[PDB]
Each structure stands twice: as C-alpha cells, then as structure tokens.
Symmetry: D2
Subunit: 121 residues, 4 copies
C-alpha cells in the first residue's frame, strides 16, 4: 500500500514530514521548502491535509494545505500515492500557490500552478 | 475584516459551511456540491482548510481540502477573502481536482483545474 | 454556430479581434489587454491561434497564443465557443501566462493560471 | 542560443517537429503524441506556435497550439527554451487540455492541466 506517513523529499529539494493519518484519513506534518517566490526568509511551516479512503485504496488520492509562516500566501497540493514500476513509492503532486493581493482587481494574477514529485527521504 | 466562518454558495451552485477558524488558522466545514465529474450520487463531504495569519490580515489568504465521500477523488481550493467594493465579502478561489488513476502511467490526465466565486449564502 | 470571427471583450476589460478562420481552422487577430503583470507599458500585441474542426462542431474547441510585444512573456488560452442559454455567444477560456526566468532553477514559479469569459464586443 | 527548430521528444514519450521560426517569431510543426485521453486512434497533428522576441533573448519564451486530428480537443503549450547546465537545450512547458462539452453547464470539467519536459530527439 502506498503510505503518506514518513519523511519525503522533492525534485526542488524541499522536505516534508507527514505523520500517522487517522481513521478519518486526516494527517498533519511540517514542510521545509527549499525555494520561495518571496525573497523573505524561509521558515518551516505547518501542513494539515487529508487522504481519500472510500474504497480503502492502495494508492490513495490526497490533498494538503501549507500555511506559510514566512509569507502571507497559501499553497495547496493534490496528488496520489503511487508504487512506481521499480517497486518504490512516489507522490505525484500538482500545486496552486496563491499570493495575497490588495485590491480585488489584482486577483487575476495571484495564482501560480506547478508540479512536484516527492520521494521517500 | 473578511471572515470565512459562515454559510457560502458558489457559481456552480454548491453550498459550503465553515465554522470557527481557530487561533492556529484552522477550520473544518462541510461541502455540498451541486455538480460532479463522476456519475456517482453526490454526498455532503468534509472540509479541512487553513487561513494564513501572517500580518493579521483583514483580507486573508486560505486553502482547504475537500474529501469526497462519493468518489475516490480529492479537491483542493486556494483563494482569498475579499471585501467587494459594494460592501460584501466575496471568496475568489481556484481549485485542483485529483482523480485516482489505476496505473502511474495514466497520472498525466488525473488533474483538472478551475475557478469558483463564493458568496455569503 | 458559434464563431470566433469578430470583436470580443472580456471580464477584465481586454478586447480582442479575431479574423476569418480559414479551412485549416486557423486564424489571427490582435489583443489589447487592459491589465498586465508587468508594470511595463501595454501595447496591442498579435494573436495567432487555431480551432478544432474534426466533426465540424457548432461550438468548437480552440486555442491561441499571444506574443507579448511589451514584455518577454507569452500567454496561451484554450476554451470553447458556446451559445449560452440566453441565446448569445460566450467564450469560456482558461489561460496559462508564462514569464521569462533567467536560470532554469527559477522555472518553478514562471507560470500563472487563470480564467476569462469573452463576450461579443 | 536556445533554438526551437528541430525534432523533440518528451517524458510521456511524444515526439514533435518544429521548423523554421520566421522573423515574426512564428513556426509550424507536427505533434505525434504517445498518449491520449480519448480511446480514439492517435494521429499526428498540426502545431502553430510563436516565440516571444522582445530583447532578442537567448533563452526565449514560447507558446503553441496543437490541433488534434483524432479528437474534438485542443491543447495549448507554454514554456521556455533553457540551456541546461550540462550544456543541452531543454524545453520546460505546462499545457492546458480543452475537451468539448455538449452543454455550457459542463464547462467546469473540460480543462486539464500538466507539465512536459522536452529534449532534442
Ligand atoms: O514564496 C512563498 O510565498 C511561499 C513559498 C513557496 C514555496 C513553493 S509551494 C510550491 C513549490 N514547491 C515547493 O517545494 N516549494 C514551492
Ligand atoms: O466528481 C468527483 O469526483 C467529485 C466532484 C467534485 C466537484 C468539483 S470540485 C471543483 C468544482 N467546483 C464545484 O463546486 N464542484 C466541482
Ligand atoms: O504582463 C505581461 O507580461 C503580459 C500581459 C499579461 C496579460 C494577461 S494574459 C491573461 C490575463 N487576461 C487578460 O485579458 N490579460 C491578462
Ligand atoms: O485525448 C485527446 O483528446 C488528445 C490527446 C492529447 C494528449 C495530451 S495533450 C498534453 C499531454 N502531453 C502529451 O504529450 N500528451 C498529452
Ligand atoms: C532536508 O533534506 C536533508 C536531509 O533530510 C537536509 O540536509 C536539508 O537541509 C533539508 N532541506 C531543507 C530545505 O530543509
Ligand atoms: C444549498 O443552498 C440552498 C440553501 O442551503 C439550498 O436551498 C440548495 O438546495 C442547496 N444547493 C445545493 C446544490 O445543494
Ligand atoms: C476596447 O473596448 C472599448 C471599445 O471596443 C475601448 O473603448 C477600450 O479602450 C478598449 N480597451 C482596451 C484595453 O484597449
Ligand atoms: C518517436 O520517437 C522516435 C524517433 O522519432 C520513434 O522511434 C518513436 O517510435 C516515436 N514515438 C512515438 C510515441 O511516436
């Protein structure tokens, strides 16, 4: 079965640690990003997410939110826990990074879209 | 201040209820979608999000994860609390829909993307 | 039938003019954006796109590219030409705005994602 | 200088051929996808893109539209010409897949999103 619980690392170099996901399929962890869109000083931020358990799947669909402690932005990732053809766990995730604009008119450019493959760290 | 706690509705016609966002920026709510990508029967589903709290922002940034109870998918929403010119709170978001593929070789078409404007229900 | 040929205007205020789409389903036009992510001075830029004609559809799928003359970025829109329940033509488009980064390491944040509903201007 | 003219291949395994990008930044090519979202039989399809030419950039920005001949869809790719540290030209893109819905009330799930790293074939 693919499991979210553990230390992971991604193609960018950010590390993330998810804990035991309870019955409700919920979990928490911490995210130490390696890069930032803000020239602010990076700090390990909290992560609180959730995984799907409808048909107690082996390679479950999930999604979590990162509360950025060093910026006013938020980031959400959705992905799936896969067991790659080489027998190892990989998380293919896609994210949306929302920035904080002032007047509602600037909103058209407050969202970035990207990829991230997390491997067991 | 733009508050997330409350009953909301959106353009597609979905309704969602957020409660008290705790000190840590966390909140839980329910999501009753009025539309589904799957032929399955729609069911109200849990919401676990979080609002950024960096400079005690009046128009805060947030992100939540919807754990579908009627599908093997997960949806992540990111956006921001704006207080529309006319005087109202309007929620501008962009979401990412993750479907469960059977093989990692199909991962490429499992993620959808869109917009959603929420308003106080 | 929904037709791309004509003057259009969007929710942001940018105007665009598409010309006669030839046999190959190809067309060209000009795009005068109303807003920009760059504080550079806006200039009407060219547009060169293409529409799908496989089953000579009435509400065709399309996509075009905007060569920004006042910035080093590019923007692509994909959408569909619809005939809204009120009898009028609307183009629901979704776009990706690519920015020009220097070192390949900055690429993770060079892409914005958004919406735009074009109505007959 | 990073050149777009040439034979390319990508992670999914698709091949694409761009020719001479004219003075105006325009180019036409063919796309032979190795993967499809539709059960239909794959067919090589036309490509009509354009590379931004603002400061005669060595690592230019571009965007193209693939007109699928085996489906009623359109795909738009945006990215940038990088010249990898090791000394090679690498194409970093993000695409947006537009499917044709029968009713505008279904428009919400017609757009997909992803990544694609191209390399000289
Ligand atoms: O710049 C910010 O405001 C917060 C940090 C952004 C980090 C982003 S989230 C997606 C991408 N992948 C990562 O591992 N980190 C960056
Ligand atoms: O089809 C499924 O697997 C779950 C249905 C989820 C509905 C989507 S998520 C974003 C979009 N906006 C909505 O309010 N509903 C749809
Ligand atoms: O800022 C730039 O570099 C170029 C102008 C960006 C304009 C964008 S493209 C998507 C969005 N919708 C519009 O009508 N214009 C903006
Ligand atoms: O299924 C269809 O309607 C057309 C198939 C298009 C294939 C997609 S477009 C982006 C992605 N990357 C590829 O190389 N192919 C797929
Ligand atoms: C995480 O990965 C390694 C070991 O886990 C560590 O040395 C590195 O500094 C961490 N990266 C960041 C950005 O925290
Ligand atoms: C939710 O909004 C109103 C009030 O909650 C309700 O009447 C309506 O039926 C609901 N819509 C959907 C799509 O569930
Ligand atoms: C386009 O729309 C109207 C009339 O077509 C015009 O007055 C306006 O200035 C134009 N907008 C821009 C951004 O060019
Ligand atoms: C394209 O790449 C090589 C050379 O063109 C070819 O052998 C291969 O079969 C092609 N791949 C696909 C997916 O068409």
């Amino acid at each position: 079965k693919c499991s979210l619980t553990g230390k992971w690392t991604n193609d960018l170099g950010s590390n993330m640690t998810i804990g035991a996901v309870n019955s409700r399929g919920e979990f928490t962890g911490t995210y130490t990003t390696a890069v930032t869109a803000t020239s602010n000083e990076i700090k390990e931020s909290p992560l609180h997410g959730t995984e799907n358990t409808i048909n107690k799947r082996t390679q479950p669909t999930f999604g979590f939110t990162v509360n950025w402690k060093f910026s006013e932005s938020t980031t959400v990732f959705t992905g799936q826990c896969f067991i790659d053809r080489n027998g190892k766990e990989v998380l293919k995730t896609m994210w949306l990074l929302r920035s904080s604009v002032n007047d509602i008119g600037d909103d058209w450019k407050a969202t970035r879209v990207g990829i991230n493959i997390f491997t067991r760290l």
